[PDB]
Amino acid sequence: GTIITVTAQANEKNTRTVSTAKGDKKIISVPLFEKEVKVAYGSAFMPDFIQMGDTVTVSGRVQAKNYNFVFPTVEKVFI
């Protein structure tokens, strides 16, 4: 299988809060690779405890249709 793991700061540039059937959720959009050609971005739902300005690690399978993480693990990173 394939696992993509991204570490990024959740901020105004890459994170939005949306209404869902499960209430307010943050959704982050992160680059799936680098360049020296446009970079593809994957989206993942954040757990409720995550706050704007947190650094997080998003890890899991990604599905392409648009790129979405599937059953991601999201961890808060501390500095």
Next chain:
Amino acid sequence: GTIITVTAQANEKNTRTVSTAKGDKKIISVPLFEKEVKVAYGSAFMPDFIQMGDTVTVSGRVQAKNYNFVFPTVEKVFI
């Protein structure tokens, strides 16, 4: 940063041996994500000890131009 980690069997379908300035190298081509839309594939050089039929974990940054792993870690997996 972004790290892509793939576990796959090195076989006739996804691995070739090529001449390089550093002698014979195996190069594996692995899918960077899944689908239900074509899947992008990344390539990585295998360490010399890897053999056809081995299962390996390839982990590292990937660069798009074509997708190549950058300074990948390659580990043999045992069953």
